[PDB]
Amino acid sequence: MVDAFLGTWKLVDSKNFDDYMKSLGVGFATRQVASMTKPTTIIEKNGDILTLKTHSTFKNTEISFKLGVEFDETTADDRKVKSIVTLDGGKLVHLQKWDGQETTLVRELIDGKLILTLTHGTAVCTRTYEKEA
Ligand SMILES: CCCCCCCCCCCCCCCCCC(=O)O
């Protein structure tokens, strides 16, 4: 399936990202900057290997992974986590685990937009991405 996620996406809406970052322990100065950053997400495939790049003026990240295979990940906020990405009900589900905690990053296509839902603790953030030509 994964093919419909592929491409370049830009952030157009964000709800409750501050709650989500607060929940992760992200300091206030970083949250400041993050609240005003509009990342670009690039999803590419080479065979069974996906690469997910997130680019912004603030921080950049890149991960490559095979679906269903665990990998080490250092997140934007400097967490060292164990991650797995799978396709579930047509959604791309990214689970990060560290120190007994979990957060999920779920990507779904709705109406041609990429909706990223981030959950940690009680905090739920929805970020909407639109496809760039
Ligand atoms: C690398 C660009 C990520 C967004 C800007 C900085 C955020 C800094 C700390 C919070 C990071 C929490 C985990 C990643 C959130 C991903 C959000 C997204 O892809 O839209």
JSON list of N, CA and C in Angstrom, two decimals, residues 34-115:
[
{"chain": "A", "resi": 34, "resn": "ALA", "atom": "N", "xyz": [9.34, 25.76, 18.26]},
{"chain": "A", "resi": 34, "resn": "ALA", "atom": "CA", "xyz": [8.65, 24.68, 17.57]},
{"chain": "A", "resi": 34, "resn": "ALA", "atom": "C", "xyz": [7.24, 25.10, 17.15]},
{"chain": "A", "resi": 35, "resn": "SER", "atom": "N", "xyz": [6.62, 25.98, 17.93]},
{"chain": "A", "resi": 35, "resn": "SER", "atom": "CA", "xyz": [5.23, 26.40, 17.69]},
{"chain": "A", "resi": 35, "resn": "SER", "atom": "C", "xyz": [5.09, 27.28, 16.46]},
{"chain": "A", "resi": 36, "resn": "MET", "atom": "N", "xyz": [6.23, 27.78, 16.01]},
{"chain": "A", "resi": 36, "resn": "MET", "atom": "CA", "xyz": [6.28, 28.70, 14.90]},
{"chain": "A", "resi": 36, "resn": "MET", "atom": "C", "xyz": [7.04, 28.12, 13.72]},
{"chain": "A", "resi": 37, "resn": "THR", "atom": "N", "xyz": [7.41, 26.85, 13.82]},
{"chain": "A", "resi": 37, "resn": "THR", "atom": "CA", "xyz": [8.09, 26.10, 12.74]},
{"chain": "A", "resi": 37, "resn": "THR", "atom": "C", "xyz": [7.10, 25.31, 11.88]},
{"chain": "A", "resi": 38, "resn": "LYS", "atom": "N", "xyz": [7.24, 25.36, 10.56]},
{"chain": "A", "resi": 38, "resn": "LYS", "atom": "CA", "xyz": [6.37, 24.59, 9.69]},
{"chain": "A", "resi": 38, "resn": "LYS", "atom": "C", "xyz": [7.26, 23.64, 8.91]},
{"chain": "A", "resi": 39, "resn": "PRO", "atom": "N", "xyz": [7.36, 22.40, 9.39]},
{"chain": "A", "resi": 39, "resn": "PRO", "atom": "CA", "xyz": [8.26, 21.44, 8.74]},
{"chain": "A", "resi": 39, "resn": "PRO", "atom": "C", "xyz": [7.77, 20.96, 7.42]},
{"chain": "A", "resi": 40, "resn": "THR", "atom": "N", "xyz": [8.72, 20.47, 6.65]},
{"chain": "A", "resi": 40, "resn": "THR", "atom": "CA", "xyz": [8.45, 19.70, 5.45]},
{"chain": "A", "resi": 40, "resn": "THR", "atom": "C", "xyz": [8.80, 18.25, 5.76]},
{"chain": "A", "resi": 41, "resn": "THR", "atom": "N", "xyz": [7.91, 17.32, 5.43]},
{"chain": "A", "resi": 41, "resn": "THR", "atom": "CA", "xyz": [8.18, 15.90, 5.59]},
{"chain": "A", "resi": 41, "resn": "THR", "atom": "C", "xyz": [8.30, 15.25, 4.25]},
{"chain": "A", "resi": 42, "resn": "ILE", "atom": "N", "xyz": [9.39, 14.53, 4.06]},
{"chain": "A", "resi": 42, "resn": "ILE", "atom": "CA", "xyz": [9.61, 13.83, 2.81]},
{"chain": "A", "resi": 42, "resn": "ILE", "atom": "C", "xyz": [9.63, 12.36, 3.10]},
{"chain": "A", "resi": 43, "resn": "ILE", "atom": "N", "xyz": [8.80, 11.61, 2.37]},
{"chain": "A", "resi": 43, "resn": "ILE", "atom": "CA", "xyz": [8.73, 10.16, 2.51]},
{"chain": "A", "resi": 43, "resn": "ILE", "atom": "C", "xyz": [9.11, 9.54, 1.20]},
{"chain": "A", "resi": 44, "resn": "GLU", "atom": "N", "xyz": [10.14, 8.73, 1.23]},
{"chain": "A", "resi": 44, "resn": "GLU", "atom": "CA", "xyz": [10.69, 8.07, 0.02]},
{"chain": "A", "resi": 44, "resn": "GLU", "atom": "C", "xyz": [10.83, 6.61, 0.30]},
{"chain": "A", "resi": 45, "resn": "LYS", "atom": "N", "xyz": [10.80, 5.83, -0.78]},
{"chain": "A", "resi": 45, "resn": "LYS", "atom": "CA", "xyz": [10.88, 4.40, -0.74]},
{"chain": "A", "resi": 45, "resn": "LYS", "atom": "C", "xyz": [11.98, 3.93, -1.69]},
{"chain": "A", "resi": 46, "resn": "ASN", "atom": "N", "xyz": [12.78, 2.97, -1.27]},
{"chain": "A", "resi": 46, "resn": "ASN", "atom": "CA", "xyz": [13.71, 2.28, -2.15]},
{"chain": "A", "resi": 46, "resn": "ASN", "atom": "C", "xyz": [13.57, 0.82, -1.82]},
{"chain": "A", "resi": 47, "resn": "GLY", "atom": "N", "xyz": [12.79, 0.10, -2.62]},
{"chain": "A", "resi": 47, "resn": "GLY", "atom": "CA", "xyz": [12.53, -1.28, -2.28]},
{"chain": "A", "resi": 47, "resn": "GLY", "atom": "C", "xyz": [11.74, -1.29, -0.99]},
{"chain": "A", "resi": 48, "resn": "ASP", "atom": "N", "xyz": [12.19, -2.12, -0.07]},
{"chain": "A", "resi": 48, "resn": "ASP", "atom": "CA", "xyz": [11.54, -2.24, 1.22]},
{"chain": "A", "resi": 48, "resn": "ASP", "atom": "C", "xyz": [12.04, -1.23, 2.22]},
{"chain": "A", "resi": 49, "resn": "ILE", "atom": "N", "xyz": [12.91, -0.34, 1.79]},
{"chain": "A", "resi": 49, "resn": "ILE", "atom": "CA", "xyz": [13.43, 0.65, 2.75]},
{"chain": "A", "resi": 49, "resn": "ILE", "atom": "C", "xyz": [12.76, 1.98, 2.55]},
{"chain": "A", "resi": 50, "resn": "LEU", "atom": "N", "xyz": [12.11, 2.49, 3.61]},
{"chain": "A", "resi": 50, "resn": "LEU", "atom": "CA", "xyz": [11.51, 3.83, 3.59]},
{"chain": "A", "resi": 50, "resn": "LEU", "atom": "C", "xyz": [12.47, 4.78, 4.26]},
{"chain": "A", "resi": 51, "resn": "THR", "atom": "N", "xyz": [12.49, 5.98, 3.76]},
{"chain": "A", "resi": 51, "resn": "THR", "atom": "CA", "xyz": [13.21, 7.06, 4.45]},
{"chain": "A", "resi": 51, "resn": "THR", "atom": "C", "xyz": [12.22, 8.18, 4.71]},
{"chain": "A", "resi": 52, "resn": "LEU", "atom": "N", "xyz": [12.28, 8.71, 5.93]},
{"chain": "A", "resi": 52, "resn": "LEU", "atom": "CA", "xyz": [11.37, 9.78, 6.31]},
{"chain": "A", "resi": 52, "resn": "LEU", "atom": "C", "xyz": [12.24, 10.91, 6.78]},
{"chain": "A", "resi": 53, "resn": "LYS", "atom": "N", "xyz": [12.20, 12.00, 6.05]},
{"chain": "A", "resi": 53, "resn": "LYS", "atom": "CA", "xyz": [12.96, 13.18, 6.38]},
{"chain": "A", "resi": 53, "resn": "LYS", "atom": "C", "xyz": [12.02, 14.23, 6.90]},
{"chain": "A", "resi": 54, "resn": "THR", "atom": "N", "xyz": [12.43, 14.92, 7.97]},
{"chain": "A", "resi": 54, "resn": "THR", "atom": "CA", "xyz": [11.68, 16.08, 8.40]},
{"chain": "A", "resi": 54, "resn": "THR", "atom": "C", "xyz": [12.62, 17.24, 8.41]},
{"chain": "A", "resi": 55, "resn": "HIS", "atom": "N", "xyz": [12.29, 18.26, 7.63]},
{"chain": "A", "resi": 55, "resn": "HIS", "atom": "CA", "xyz": [13.15, 19.42, 7.47]},
{"chain": "A", "resi": 55, "resn": "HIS", "atom": "C", "xyz": [12.48, 20.64, 8.00]},
{"chain": "A", "resi": 56, "resn": "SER", "atom": "N", "xyz": [13.25, 21.47, 8.68]},
{"chain": "A", "resi": 56, "resn": "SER", "atom": "CA", "xyz": [12.72, 22.75, 9.12]},
{"chain": "A", "resi": 56, "resn": "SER", "atom": "C", "xyz": [13.86, 23.70, 9.35]},
{"chain": "A", "resi": 57, "resn": "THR", "atom": "N", "xyz": [13.49, 24.93, 9.71]},
{"chain": "A", "resi": 57, "resn": "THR", "atom": "CA", "xyz": [14.49, 25.95, 9.96]},
{"chain": "A", "resi": 57, "resn": "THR", "atom": "C", "xyz": [15.13, 25.71, 11.30]},
{"chain": "A", "resi": 58, "resn": "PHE", "atom": "N", "xyz": [14.51, 24.86, 12.10]},
{"chain": "A", "resi": 58, "resn": "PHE", "atom": "CA", "xyz": [14.97, 24.69, 13.47]},
{"chain": "A", "resi": 58, "resn": "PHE", "atom": "C", "xyz": [15.81, 23.43, 13.58]},
{"chain": "A", "resi": 59, "resn": "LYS", "atom": "N", "xyz": [15.16, 22.31, 13.35]},
{"chain": "A", "resi": 59, "resn": "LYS", "atom": "CA", "xyz": [15.77, 21.00, 13.47]},
{"chain": "A", "resi": 59, "resn": "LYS", "atom": "C", "xyz": [15.48, 20.18, 12.24]},
{"chain": "A", "resi": 60, "resn": "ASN", "atom": "N", "xyz": [16.40, 19.27, 11.94]},
{"chain": "A", "resi": 60, "resn": "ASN", "atom": "CA", "xyz": [16.18, 18.33, 10.88]},
{"chain": "A", "resi": 60, "resn": "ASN", "atom": "C", "xyz": [16.37, 16.94, 11.38]},
{"chain": "A", "resi": 61, "resn": "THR", "atom": "N", "xyz": [15.57, 16.01, 10.87]},
{"chain": "A", "resi": 61, "resn": "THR", "atom": "CA", "xyz": [15.78, 14.62, 11.21]},
{"chain": "A", "resi": 61, "resn": "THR", "atom": "C", "xyz": [15.64, 13.75, 9.97]},
{"chain": "A", "resi": 62, "resn": "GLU", "atom": "N", "xyz": [16.22, 12.56, 10.04]},
{"chain": "A", "resi": 62, "resn": "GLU", "atom": "CA", "xyz": [16.08, 11.59, 8.97]},
{"chain": "A", "resi": 62, "resn": "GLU", "atom": "C", "xyz": [16.18, 10.22, 9.55]},
{"chain": "A", "resi": 63, "resn": "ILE", "atom": "N", "xyz": [15.22, 9.37, 9.19]},
{"chain": "A", "resi": 63, "resn": "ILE", "atom": "CA", "xyz": [15.31, 8.00, 9.57]},
{"chain": "A", "resi": 63, "resn": "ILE", "atom": "C", "xyz": [15.06, 7.15, 8.33]},
{"chain": "A", "resi": 64, "resn": "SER", "atom": "N", "xyz": [15.71, 5.98, 8.28]},
{"chain": "A", "resi": 64, "resn": "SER", "atom": "CA", "xyz": [15.41, 5.01, 7.26]},
{"chain": "A", "resi": 64, "resn": "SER", "atom": "C", "xyz": [15.03, 3.76, 7.98]},
{"chain": "A", "resi": 65, "resn": "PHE", "atom": "N", "xyz": [14.09, 3.01, 7.42]},
{"chain": "A", "resi": 65, "resn": "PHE", "atom": "CA", "xyz": [13.65, 1.81, 8.14]},
{"chain": "A", "resi": 65, "resn": "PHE", "atom": "C", "xyz": [12.94, 0.89, 7.20]},
{"chain": "A", "resi": 66, "resn": "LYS", "atom": "N", "xyz": [12.86, -0.35, 7.62]},
{"chain": "A", "resi": 66, "resn": "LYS", "atom": "CA", "xyz": [12.02, -1.31, 6.95]},
{"chain": "A", "resi": 66, "resn": "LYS", "atom": "C", "xyz": [10.75, -1.42, 7.77]},
{"chain": "A", "resi": 67, "resn": "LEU", "atom": "N", "xyz": [9.61, -1.52, 7.11]},
{"chain": "A", "resi": 67, "resn": "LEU", "atom": "CA", "xyz": [8.39, -1.71, 7.86]},
{"chain": "A", "resi": 67, "resn": "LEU", "atom": "C", "xyz": [8.43, -3.00, 8.68]},
{"chain": "A", "resi": 68, "resn": "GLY", "atom": "N", "xyz": [7.96, -2.89, 9.92]},
{"chain": "A", "resi": 68, "resn": "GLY", "atom": "CA", "xyz": [7.91, -4.07, 10.77]},
{"chain": "A", "resi": 68, "resn": "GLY", "atom": "C", "xyz": [9.23, -4.50, 11.39]},
{"chain": "A", "resi": 69, "resn": "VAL", "atom": "N", "xyz": [10.30, -3.75, 11.16]},
{"chain": "A", "resi": 69, "resn": "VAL", "atom": "CA", "xyz": [11.59, -4.08, 11.74]},
{"chain": "A", "resi": 69, "resn": "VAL", "atom": "C", "xyz": [12.05, -2.97, 12.67]},
{"chain": "A", "resi": 70, "resn": "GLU", "atom": "N", "xyz": [12.41, -3.34, 13.90]},
{"chain": "A", "resi": 70, "resn": "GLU", "atom": "CA", "xyz": [12.76, -2.33, 14.89]},
{"chain": "A", "resi": 70, "resn": "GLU", "atom": "C", "xyz": [14.04, -1.63, 14.56]},
{"chain": "A", "resi": 71, "resn": "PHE", "atom": "N", "xyz": [14.13, -0.35, 14.93]},
{"chain": "A", "resi": 71, "resn": "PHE", "atom": "CA", "xyz": [15.35, 0.38, 14.72]},
{"chain": "A", "resi": 71, "resn": "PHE", "atom": "C", "xyz": [15.53, 1.39, 15.83]},
{"chain": "A", "resi": 72, "resn": "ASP", "atom": "N", "xyz": [16.79, 1.71, 16.07]},
{"chain": "A", "resi": 72, "resn": "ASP", "atom": "CA", "xyz": [17.15, 2.80, 16.95]},
{"chain": "A", "resi": 72, "resn": "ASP", "atom": "C", "xyz": [16.96, 4.13, 16.25]},
{"chain": "A", "resi": 73, "resn": "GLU", "atom": "N", "xyz": [16.49, 5.08, 17.03]},
{"chain": "A", "resi": 73, "resn": "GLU", "atom": "CA", "xyz": [16.14, 6.38, 16.56]},
{"chain": "A", "resi": 73, "resn": "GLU", "atom": "C", "xyz": [16.53, 7.43, 17.62]},
{"chain": "A", "resi": 74, "resn": "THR", "atom": "N", "xyz": [17.11, 8.50, 17.15]},
{"chain": "A", "resi": 74, "resn": "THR", "atom": "CA", "xyz": [17.33, 9.64, 18.03]},
{"chain": "A", "resi": 74, "resn": "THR", "atom": "C", "xyz": [16.40, 10.71, 17.56]},
{"chain": "A", "resi": 75, "resn": "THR", "atom": "N", "xyz": [15.46, 11.07, 18.41]},
{"chain": "A", "resi": 75, "resn": "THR", "atom": "CA", "xyz": [14.43, 12.02, 18.01]},
{"chain": "A", "resi": 75, "resn": "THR", "atom": "C", "xyz": [14.85, 13.46, 18.04]},
{"chain": "A", "resi": 76, "resn": "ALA", "atom": "N", "xyz": [13.97, 14.29, 17.50]},
{"chain": "A", "resi": 76, "resn": "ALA", "atom": "CA", "xyz": [14.26, 15.72, 17.38]},
{"chain": "A", "resi": 76, "resn": "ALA", "atom": "C", "xyz": [14.56, 16.35, 18.74]},
{"chain": "A", "resi": 77, "resn": "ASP", "atom": "N", "xyz": [13.89, 15.86, 19.77]},
{"chain": "A", "resi": 77, "resn": "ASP", "atom": "CA", "xyz": [14.11, 16.37, 21.11]},
{"chain": "A", "resi": 77, "resn": "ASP", "atom": "C", "xyz": [15.14, 15.56, 21.86]},
{"chain": "A", "resi": 78, "resn": "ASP", "atom": "N", "xyz": [15.95, 14.81, 21.13]},
{"chain": "A", "resi": 78, "resn": "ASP", "atom": "CA", "xyz": [17.10, 14.12, 21.70]},
{"chain": "A", "resi": 78, "resn": "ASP", "atom": "C", "xyz": [16.79, 12.92, 22.59]},
{"chain": "A", "resi": 79, "resn": "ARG", "atom": "N", "xyz": [15.61, 12.33, 22.43]},
{"chain": "A", "resi": 79, "resn": "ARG", "atom": "CA", "xyz": [15.34, 11.03, 23.00]},
{"chain": "A", "resi": 79, "resn": "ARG", "atom": "C", "xyz": [15.98, 9.93, 22.17]},
{"chain": "A", "resi": 80, "resn": "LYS", "atom": "N", "xyz": [16.55, 8.97, 22.86]},
{"chain": "A", "resi": 80, "resn": "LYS", "atom": "CA", "xyz": [17.07, 7.77, 22.22]},
{"chain": "A", "resi": 80, "resn": "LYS", "atom": "C", "xyz": [15.99, 6.71, 22.40]},
{"chain": "A", "resi": 81, "resn": "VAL", "atom": "N", "xyz": [15.36, 6.33, 21.31]},
{"chain": "A", "resi": 81, "resn": "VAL", "atom": "CA", "xyz": [14.21, 5.47, 21.43]},
{"chain": "A", "resi": 81, "resn": "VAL", "atom": "C", "xyz": [14.37, 4.25, 20.53]},
{"chain": "A", "resi": 82, "resn": "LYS", "atom": "N", "xyz": [13.52, 3.27, 20.77]},
{"chain": "A", "resi": 82, "resn": "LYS", "atom": "CA", "xyz": [13.42, 2.09, 19.92]},
{"chain": "A", "resi": 82, "resn": "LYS", "atom": "C", "xyz": [12.15, 2.23, 19.15]},
{"chain": "A", "resi": 83, "resn": "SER", "atom": "N", "xyz": [12.23, 2.12, 17.84]},
{"chain": "A", "resi": 83, "resn": "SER", "atom": "CA", "xyz": [11.09, 2.49, 17.01]},
{"chain": "A", "resi": 83, "resn": "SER", "atom": "C", "xyz": [10.68, 1.35, 16.10]},
{"chain": "A", "resi": 84, "resn": "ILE", "atom": "N", "xyz": [9.41, 1.33, 15.74]},
{"chain": "A", "resi": 84, "resn": "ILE", "atom": "CA", "xyz": [8.94, 0.41, 14.73]},
{"chain": "A", "resi": 84, "resn": "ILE", "atom": "C", "xyz": [7.85, 1.10, 13.96]},
{"chain": "A", "resi": 85, "resn": "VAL", "atom": "N", "xyz": [7.81, 0.86, 12.66]},
{"chain": "A", "resi": 85, "resn": "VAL", "atom": "CA", "xyz": [6.84, 1.53, 11.83]},
{"chain": "A", "resi": 85, "resn": "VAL", "atom": "C", "xyz": [6.10, 0.44, 11.09]},
{"chain": "A", "resi": 86, "resn": "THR", "atom": "N", "xyz": [4.78, 0.51, 11.07]},
{"chain": "A", "resi": 86, "resn": "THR", "atom": "CA", "xyz": [4.04, -0.54, 10.39]},
{"chain": "A", "resi": 86, "resn": "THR", "atom": "C", "xyz": [2.89, 0.08, 9.67]},
{"chain": "A", "resi": 87, "resn": "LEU", "atom": "N", "xyz": [2.28, -0.71, 8.78]},
{"chain": "A", "resi": 87, "resn": "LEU", "atom": "CA", "xyz": [1.06, -0.30, 8.14]},
{"chain": "A", "resi": 87, "resn": "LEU", "atom": "C", "xyz": [-0.08, -1.00, 8.86]},
{"chain": "A", "resi": 88, "resn": "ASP", "atom": "N", "xyz": [-1.06, -0.22, 9.30]},
{"chain": "A", "resi": 88, "resn": "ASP", "atom": "CA", "xyz": [-2.15, -0.74, 10.06]},
{"chain": "A", "resi": 88, "resn": "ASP", "atom": "C", "xyz": [-3.44, -0.07, 9.60]},
{"chain": "A", "resi": 89, "resn": "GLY", "atom": "N", "xyz": [-4.33, -0.82, 8.98]},
{"chain": "A", "resi": 89, "resn": "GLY", "atom": "CA", "xyz": [-5.58, -0.27, 8.52]},
{"chain": "A", "resi": 89, "resn": "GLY", "atom": "C", "xyz": [-5.36, 0.86, 7.54]},
{"chain": "A", "resi": 90, "resn": "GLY", "atom": "N", "xyz": [-4.26, 0.78, 6.78]},
{"chain": "A", "resi": 90, "resn": "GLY", "atom": "CA", "xyz": [-3.97, 1.78, 5.80]},
{"chain": "A", "resi": 90, "resn": "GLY", "atom": "C", "xyz": [-3.22, 2.97, 6.40]},
{"chain": "A", "resi": 91, "resn": "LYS", "atom": "N", "xyz": [-3.00, 2.96, 7.71]},
{"chain": "A", "resi": 91, "resn": "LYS", "atom": "CA", "xyz": [-2.25, 4.04, 8.38]},
{"chain": "A", "resi": 91, "resn": "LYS", "atom": "C", "xyz": [-0.81, 3.64, 8.60]},
{"chain": "A", "resi": 92, "resn": "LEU", "atom": "N", "xyz": [0.07, 4.64, 8.56]},
{"chain": "A", "resi": 92, "resn": "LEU", "atom": "CA", "xyz": [1.42, 4.38, 8.82]},
{"chain": "A", "resi": 92, "resn": "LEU", "atom": "C", "xyz": [1.58, 4.69, 10.30]},
{"chain": "A", "resi": 93, "resn": "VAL", "atom": "N", "xyz": [1.84, 3.65, 11.08]},
{"chain": "A", "resi": 93, "resn": "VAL", "atom": "CA", "xyz": [1.94, 3.78, 12.53]},
{"chain": "A", "resi": 93, "resn": "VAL", "atom": "C", "xyz": [3.37, 3.66, 13.01]},
{"chain": "A", "resi": 94, "resn": "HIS", "atom": "N", "xyz": [3.85, 4.70, 13.70]},
{"chain": "A", "resi": 94, "resn": "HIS", "atom": "CA", "xyz": [5.24, 4.75, 14.15]},
{"chain": "A", "resi": 94, "resn": "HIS", "atom": "C", "xyz": [5.16, 4.77, 15.66]},
{"chain": "A", "resi": 95, "resn": "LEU", "atom": "N", "xyz": [5.74, 3.74, 16.25]},
{"chain": "A", "resi": 95, "resn": "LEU", "atom": "CA", "xyz": [5.75, 3.63, 17.70]},
{"chain": "A", "resi": 95, "resn": "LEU", "atom": "C", "xyz": [7.16, 3.83, 18.20]},
{"chain": "A", "resi": 96, "resn": "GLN", "atom": "N", "xyz": [7.33, 4.71, 19.19]},
{"chain": "A", "resi": 96, "resn": "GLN", "atom": "CA", "xyz": [8.62, 4.92, 19.80]},
{"chain": "A", "resi": 96, "resn": "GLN", "atom": "C", "xyz": [8.52, 4.50, 21.23]},
{"chain": "A", "resi": 97, "resn": "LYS", "atom": "N", "xyz": [9.54, 3.79, 21.67]},
{"chain": "A", "resi": 97, "resn": "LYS", "atom": "CA", "xyz": [9.56, 3.33, 23.05]},
{"chain": "A", "resi": 97, "resn": "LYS", "atom": "C", "xyz": [10.88, 3.71, 23.70]},
{"chain": "A", "resi": 98, "resn": "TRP", "atom": "N", "xyz": [10.82, 4.25, 24.90]},
{"chain": "A", "resi": 98, "resn": "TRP", "atom": "CA", "xyz": [12.04, 4.55, 25.64]},
{"chain": "A", "resi": 98, "resn": "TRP", "atom": "C", "xyz": [11.69, 4.64, 27.09]},
{"chain": "A", "resi": 99, "resn": "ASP", "atom": "N", "xyz": [12.58, 4.09, 27.91]},
{"chain": "A", "resi": 99, "resn": "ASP", "atom": "CA", "xyz": [12.40, 4.13, 29.35]},
{"chain": "A", "resi": 99, "resn": "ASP", "atom": "C", "xyz": [10.99, 3.83, 29.82]},
{"chain": "A", "resi": 100, "resn": "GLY", "atom": "N", "xyz": [10.37, 2.84, 29.19]},
{"chain": "A", "resi": 100, "resn": "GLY", "atom": "CA", "xyz": [9.08, 2.35, 29.64]},
{"chain": "A", "resi": 100, "resn": "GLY", "atom": "C", "xyz": [7.93, 3.17, 29.10]},
{"chain": "A", "resi": 101, "resn": "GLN", "atom": "N", "xyz": [8.27, 4.30, 28.48]},
{"chain": "A", "resi": 101, "resn": "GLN", "atom": "CA", "xyz": [7.28, 5.19, 27.90]},
{"chain": "A", "resi": 101, "resn": "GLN", "atom": "C", "xyz": [7.08, 4.88, 26.43]},
{"chain": "A", "resi": 102, "resn": "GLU", "atom": "N", "xyz": [5.98, 5.39, 25.89]},
{"chain": "A", "resi": 102, "resn": "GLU", "atom": "CA", "xyz": [5.64, 5.18, 24.48]},
{"chain": "A", "resi": 102, "resn": "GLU", "atom": "C", "xyz": [5.05, 6.43, 23.95]},
{"chain": "A", "resi": 103, "resn": "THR", "atom": "N", "xyz": [5.30, 6.66, 22.67]},
{"chain": "A", "resi": 103, "resn": "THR", "atom": "CA", "xyz": [4.50, 7.63, 22.01]},
{"chain": "A", "resi": 103, "resn": "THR", "atom": "C", "xyz": [4.24, 7.08, 20.63]},
{"chain": "A", "resi": 104, "resn": "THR", "atom": "N", "xyz": [3.10, 7.44, 20.06]},
{"chain": "A", "resi": 104, "resn": "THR", "atom": "CA", "xyz": [2.78, 7.02, 18.71]},
{"chain": "A", "resi": 104, "resn": "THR", "atom": "C", "xyz": [2.61, 8.18, 17.80]},
{"chain": "A", "resi": 105, "resn": "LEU", "atom": "N", "xyz": [3.07, 7.96, 16.59]},
{"chain": "A", "resi": 105, "resn": "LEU", "atom": "CA", "xyz": [3.00, 8.97, 15.55]},
{"chain": "A", "resi": 105, "resn": "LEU", "atom": "C", "xyz": [2.22, 8.28, 14.45]},
{"chain": "A", "resi": 106, "resn": "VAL", "atom": "N", "xyz": [0.95, 8.64, 14.27]},
{"chain": "A", "resi": 106, "resn": "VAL", "atom": "CA", "xyz": [0.16, 7.91, 13.28]},
{"chain": "A", "resi": 106, "resn": "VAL", "atom": "C", "xyz": [-0.13, 8.79, 12.10]},
{"chain": "A", "resi": 107, "resn": "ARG", "atom": "N", "xyz": [0.13, 8.27, 10.92]},
{"chain": "A", "resi": 107, "resn": "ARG", "atom": "CA", "xyz": [-0.14, 9.03, 9.68]},
{"chain": "A", "resi": 107, "resn": "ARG", "atom": "C", "xyz": [-1.19, 8.38, 8.85]},
{"chain": "A", "resi": 108, "resn": "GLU", "atom": "N", "xyz": [-2.18, 9.19, 8.48]},
{"chain": "A", "resi": 108, "resn": "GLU", "atom": "CA", "xyz": [-3.31, 8.67, 7.74]},
{"chain": "A", "resi": 108, "resn": "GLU", "atom": "C", "xyz": [-3.56, 9.64, 6.64]},
{"chain": "A", "resi": 109, "resn": "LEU", "atom": "N", "xyz": [-4.11, 9.15, 5.53]},
{"chain": "A", "resi": 109, "resn": "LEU", "atom": "CA", "xyz": [-4.49, 10.00, 4.44]},
{"chain": "A", "resi": 109, "resn": "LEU", "atom": "C", "xyz": [-5.97, 10.22, 4.48]},
{"chain": "A", "resi": 110, "resn": "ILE", "atom": "N", "xyz": [-6.36, 11.48, 4.55]},
{"chain": "A", "resi": 110, "resn": "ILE", "atom": "CA", "xyz": [-7.78, 11.80, 4.55]},
{"chain": "A", "resi": 110, "resn": "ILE", "atom": "C", "xyz": [-7.99, 12.93, 3.59]},
{"chain": "A", "resi": 111, "resn": "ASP", "atom": "N", "xyz": [-8.81, 12.70, 2.56]},
{"chain": "A", "resi": 111, "resn": "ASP", "atom": "CA", "xyz": [-9.14, 13.78, 1.62]},
{"chain": "A", "resi": 111, "resn": "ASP", "atom": "C", "xyz": [-7.87, 14.27, 0.95]},
{"chain": "A", "resi": 112, "resn": "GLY", "atom": "N", "xyz": [-6.89, 13.37, 0.84]},
{"chain": "A", "resi": 112, "resn": "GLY", "atom": "CA", "xyz": [-5.65, 13.71, 0.18]},
{"chain": "A", "resi": 112, "resn": "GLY", "atom": "C", "xyz": [-4.67, 14.47, 1.07]},
{"chain": "A", "resi": 113, "resn": "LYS", "atom": "N", "xyz": [-5.07, 14.78, 2.31]},
{"chain": "A", "resi": 113, "resn": "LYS", "atom": "CA", "xyz": [-4.13, 15.38, 3.28]},
{"chain": "A", "resi": 113, "resn": "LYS", "atom": "C", "xyz": [-3.54, 14.30, 4.14]},
{"chain": "A", "resi": 114, "resn": "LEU", "atom": "N", "xyz": [-2.36, 14.55, 4.70]},
{"chain": "A", "resi": 114, "resn": "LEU", "atom": "CA", "xyz": [-1.66, 13.58, 5.53]},
{"chain": "A", "resi": 114, "resn": "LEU", "atom": "C", "xyz": [-1.96, 14.10, 6.92]},
{"chain": "A", "resi": 115, "resn": "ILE", "atom": "N", "xyz": [-2.63, 13.30, 7.73]},
{"chain": "A", "resi": 115, "resn": "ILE", "atom": "CA", "xyz": [-2.91, 13.75, 9.08]},
{"chain": "A", "resi": 115, "resn": "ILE", "atom": "C", "xyz": [-1.97, 12.97, 9.99]}
]
